[PDB]
Design an enzyme around this catalytic site. Structure first.
Site, short mmCIF file in Angstrom:
data_model
loop_
_atom_site.label_atom_id
_atom_site.label_comp_id
_atom_site.label_asym_id
_atom_site.label_seq_id
_atom_site.Cartn_x
_atom_site.Cartn_y
_atom_site.Cartn_z
N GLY B 47 -4.23 -37.14 -45.85
CA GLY B 47 -3.23 -36.41 -46.27
C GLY B 47 -3.00 -36.47 -47.48
O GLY B 47 -3.61 -36.83 -48.47
N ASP B 155 11.17 -32.03 -43.49
CA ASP B 155 9.67 -31.72 -43.33
C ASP B 155 9.25 -31.44 -41.76
O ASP B 155 8.16 -31.60 -41.25
CB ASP B 155 8.65 -32.64 -43.70
CG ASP B 155 7.17 -32.05 -44.22
OD1 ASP B 155 6.95 -31.05 -44.11
OD2 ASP B 155 6.48 -33.07 -44.40
#
Ligand SMILES: CC(C)n1c2c(c3c1-c1c(Br)c(Br)c(Br)c(Br)c1C3=O)C(=O)CCC2
Ligand SMILES: CC(C)n1c2c(c3c1-c1c(Br)c(Br)c(Br)c(Br)c1C3=O)C(=O)CCC2
Lengths: 328, 328
Positions: B47, B155
């Site tokens: 990520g 998010d």
């Protein structure tokens, strides 16, 4: 002492006045699209860096072109993507519509607007004088736009100019070699196709700028009006500079390398020789004379200079008499 | 004059009624575990902020997930840890099991409960209407809990919703972007993924609140019922707002920025244009109609509003007819 530094005479600082994010492409984050939106219809061609397909966007049944990239540093992929996104919407710039992840190669695939191109090997044989002026003007629109946005294309050549001749439409494509211009930066000289490499690339002068593209444009123009494609047809980089010097002369070449204190590769010593600057009239004959005129020769002469600083800018080029009739 | 201030219409003062220690994460002291309790089995992914591994706790032979963090401000690690610990045990919130630090490299790693996720690219294509209602309800449980605890996730998106479909289990993960809500506080608008950013982020209105998450939820819901991922497919943040305005219309958008006296970035001028509010029927077709119903469209419409104060809260959302059958 080392080579003399150089700066672009136009658009010199445009990237410095931008936010960092505009040119700092290494930090760009790619938002992937949905690759199941596209089905490949047929292969259109293959290149050094990619394979090209005609495909269908099945969500809206629209024709698109998919460029599946061959493996390369992610940094170069980010550079091409960032440049395409910076230039999107500009005059005669190919439009990047989406970015997906190829299921087979696991590599990125760039999705582009479709263009119904006429292959240049068959188009240039049929181009009239006015057609050449018109399409040169369109290319100059694209080049002035990208230069004003702080970007040099570095791969201008007929294969990278898509022309839908039925609609007088033109797109400048393949930005995989393009770079951001920064004053004082030294660039890789192994760019562009051999026949279109500027002398700064052939003598290994790294602090070049937008004017490189202009040299390439001149080469294209030379091949169109004289009907000799490519015009400078060298067998390698050394022989390429030799072919150039047999037309432009060696005196201006040596003045060029003296002005910038360029260390000439020793191998050139025994092959450049001494050559006079030729007059363009020697390339005119009965089969190309209808495309050659005083205006065309003046414009061409002002594009093909050894000294990159002495070449016309894209805007100056657009203001040349050669284009008056196109400007209407 | 400046922008008009705003407050959350629910859970407005929950953090002020808490002890300072609850939300003042800058003063949080991390309780470290022993890194030697865990052996890495295999890498699960990469990520922006972390790399994710499947690992084994060898003291009790239990499977866990280890998120090894990339360099980041210690304050943000403290924030994520404090939020995870405040929310631990809440409905459908991922459980933080341990926090360790490599004794040599000093990099931190967060240890989490394991979840056997089916990747959404394969799950969402197989979900029935009832499945979508069920998992939306589970997400709403998580969101109402964290909002009631004074925390916004910031998010919300499919990648941050882990689903074990065999066991009908769901976990909301990746709280590294979450923040504590305080009335009158101005927040960073550079949060969330492009496709899920609320209009308040895209127009640079900083005094937002929990309702941001609800916008993201609406985006998710749209992509699931219409089978269109992402639903708002912008090229950048500006074009993202353009994509939103082409569906919700520009008139409500300008009413929104007028109500809060928002200074619109000048560049939006030449790209927003004029757009009517579209009816959702234009996204319904033969392949998704079994997922679209009047209730689903009513719920979706009540989530995707420009004015963050007019969006449904998580609890109001949970009381919508769309979920009656799930409520049983
Ligand atoms: C000559 C042709 C086959 N072609 C090539 C490339 C590309 C194309 C091409 C076409 Br045609 C069209 Br129409 C669009 Br639109 C776009 Br974009 C492209 C493109 O990027 C390469 O990059 C290298 C190999 C040759
Ligand atoms: C998609 C997957 C590889 N994944 C990623 C992340 C994370 C996961 C993941 C999984 Br799977 C599981 Br199961 C649990 Br439990 C937890 Br926690 C996580 C997590 O935090 C990132 O943070 C960014 C990179 C992608």
């Amino acid at each position: 002492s080392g080579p003399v530094p150089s700066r672009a005479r136009v658009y010199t600082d445009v990237n410095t006045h931008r936010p960092r994010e505009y040119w700092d492409y290494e930090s760009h984050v790619v938002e992937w699209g949905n690759q199941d939106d596209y089905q490949l219809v047929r292969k259109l061609g293959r290149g050094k860096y990619s394979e090209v397909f005609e495909a269908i966007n099945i969500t809206n049944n629209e024709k698109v072109v998919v460029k599946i990239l061959k493996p390369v540093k992610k940094k170069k992929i980010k550079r091409e993507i960032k440049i395409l996104e910076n230039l999107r919407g500009g005059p005669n710039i190919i439009t990047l519509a989406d970015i997906v992840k190829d299921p087979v190669s696991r590599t990125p695939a760039l999705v582009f607007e479709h263009v119904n191109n006429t292959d240049f090997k068959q188009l240039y044989q049929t181009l009239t004088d006015y057609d050449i002026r018109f399409y040169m003007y369109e290319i100059l629109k694209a080049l002035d736009y990208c230069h004003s946005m702080g970007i040099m294309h570095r791969d201008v050549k007929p294969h990278n100019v898509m022309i839908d001749h039925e609609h007088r439409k033109l797109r400048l494509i393949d930005w995989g070699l393009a770079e951001f211009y920064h004053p004082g930066q030294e660039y890789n000289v192994r760019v562009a196709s051999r026949y279109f490499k500027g002398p700064e690339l052939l003598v290994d002068y790294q602090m070049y700028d937008y004017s490189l593209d202009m040299w390439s444009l001149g080469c294209m123009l030379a091949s169109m009006i004289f009907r000799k494609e490519p015009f400078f047809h060298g067998h390698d980089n050394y022989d390429q500079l030799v072919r150039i010097a047999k037309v432009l002369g060696t005196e201006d070449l040596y003045d060029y390398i003296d002005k910038y204190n360029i260390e000439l590769d020793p191998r050139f010593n025994d092959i450049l020789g001494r050559h006079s600057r030729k007059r363009w009239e020697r390339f005119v004959h009965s089969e190309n004379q209808h495309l050659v005129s005083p205006e065309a020769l003046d414009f061409l002469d002002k594009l093909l200079r050894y000294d990159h600083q002495s070449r016309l800018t894209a805007r100056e080029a657009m203001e040349h008499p050669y284009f008056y009739t196109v400007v209407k």
